Amino acid sequence: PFTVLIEGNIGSGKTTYLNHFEKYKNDICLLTEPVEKWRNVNGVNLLELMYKDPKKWAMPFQSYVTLTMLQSHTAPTNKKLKIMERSIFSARYCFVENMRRNGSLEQGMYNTLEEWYKFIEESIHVQADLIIYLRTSPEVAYERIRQRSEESCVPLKYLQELHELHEDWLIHQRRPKVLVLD
Amino acid sequence: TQPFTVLIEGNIGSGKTTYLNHFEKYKNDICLLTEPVEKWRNVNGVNLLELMYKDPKKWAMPFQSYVTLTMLQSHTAPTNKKLKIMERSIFSARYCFVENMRRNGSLEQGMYNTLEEWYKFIEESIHVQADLIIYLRTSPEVAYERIRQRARSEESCVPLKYLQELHELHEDWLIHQRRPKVLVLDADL
Numbered sequence A: 001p002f003t004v005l006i007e008g009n010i011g012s013g014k015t016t017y018l019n020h021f022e023k024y025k026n027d028i029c030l031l032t033e034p035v036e037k038w039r040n041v042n043g044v045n046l047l048e049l050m051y052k053d054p055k056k057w058a059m060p061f062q063s064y065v066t067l068t069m070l071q072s073h074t075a076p077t078n079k080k081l082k083i084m085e086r087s088i089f090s091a092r093y094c095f096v097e098n099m100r101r102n103g104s105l106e107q108g109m110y111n112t113l114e115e116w117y118k119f120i121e122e123s124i125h126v127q128a129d130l131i132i133y134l135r136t137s138p139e140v141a142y143e144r145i146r147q148r149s150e151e152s153c154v155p156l157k158y159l160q161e162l163h164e165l166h167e168d169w170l171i172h173q174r175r176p177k178v179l180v181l182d
Numbered sequence B: 001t002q003p004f005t006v007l008i009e010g011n012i013g014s015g016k017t018t019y020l021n022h023f024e025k026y027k028n029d030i031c032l033l034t035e036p037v038e039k040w041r042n043v044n045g046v047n048l049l050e051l052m053y054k055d056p057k058k059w060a061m062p063f064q065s066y067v068t069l070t071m072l073q074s075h076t077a078p079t080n081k082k083l084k085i086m087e088r089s090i091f092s093a094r095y096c097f098v099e100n101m102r103r104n105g106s107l108e109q110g111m112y113n114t115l116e117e118w119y120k121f122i123e124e125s126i127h128v129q130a131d132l133i134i135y136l137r138t139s140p141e142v143a144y145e146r147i148r149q150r151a152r153s154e155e156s157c158v159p160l161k162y163l164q165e166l167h168e169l170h171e172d173w174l175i176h177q178r179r180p181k182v183l184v185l186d187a188d189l
């Protein structure tokens, strides 16, 4: 099916934007970021644990993120258009890269996650037809986060870092059709 | 797309490498798959096996994640041969090795739960071919001696206690069963 990925920083407006599509649920496969799964891995909130102790929990959290995303990407649909919030690509190019850069993933941990990504991309073609990038400034992103969880103590520098990674990927073509919304 | 497949299972020091070498003269008809130790030793220059033995609380989860991946790659590896024989499996990883790291505290609940979600999704996504298991049944002490009598490597300091627990887990799975056809070989010889 035709596949659209909604990408953007934390606090870039994706959840509000996606709520619009909650009424097209019989023409469109609407796959919202599985944060509820991440908050409840048979009683364990991996999202909370990662934010609390990244050096310990970034690895298993991102591994579980990789799996949930992989599930969403490969889920069957009759609908002729699929819309997904985030992807295995942003997990890899932005989130995992940043955790490597900031030291939360030691080399062997980074390497394990990379081998999974390589294996997935060799075993299957993941459908990405269109990327919609909700582009924001880290300041704007920071303020959405504060005007509304586990993530509320993200520093601005962390948002700045995730911002440039999205810019590198989606504007400057430093990683592998992109529509840039404001 | 997979041939009749035999998995060779046993404790560390149960004689699996020696046993598997007997099938090398039959490589015309047998796809022979050694446990992917060489991969684990060199994950883009990182030895995950050594790191796991050095500090299991830190490295058990990424190590067993990569083990899963490499076993998956062996299970699914393409062959024209009539028979595939594999050293260990995604089953011993899950039911023995991960189970013991969970019990001894190297894997916390969330870490264990992540690996289990992977195993669940793998068994929903593919049928892993497993037609026969050959269990090399040894006593922990003989396994222990075997390890101590051979070249120094990452596992050379595994305690007898660790071996004893792995033994009971192999017994749970392959004898009591207890876990979801086994030929039992006396490998204490």
Ligand SMILES: Nc1ccn([C@@H]2O[C@H](CO)[C@@H](O)C2(F)F)c(=O)n1
Binding pocket: A009, A010, A033, A035, A065, A086, A090, A091, A092, A095, A096, A151
């Ligand atoms: N690959 C990913 C994807 C998402 N997240 C985090 O999940 C929360 C909800 O989007 C956000 O707090 C978050 F974006 F930071 C993450 O840490 N890594």
Ligand SMILES: Nc1ccn([C@@H]2O[C@H](CO)[C@@H](O)C2(F)F)c(=O)n1
Binding pocket: B012, B035, B037, B067, B088, B092, B093, B094, B097, B098, B155
């Ligand atoms: N799932 C698995 C499979 C194997 N191993 C370990 O790998 C080494 C070589 O057999 C042995 O030291 C070993 F068997 F312990 C492991 O830790 N976890």
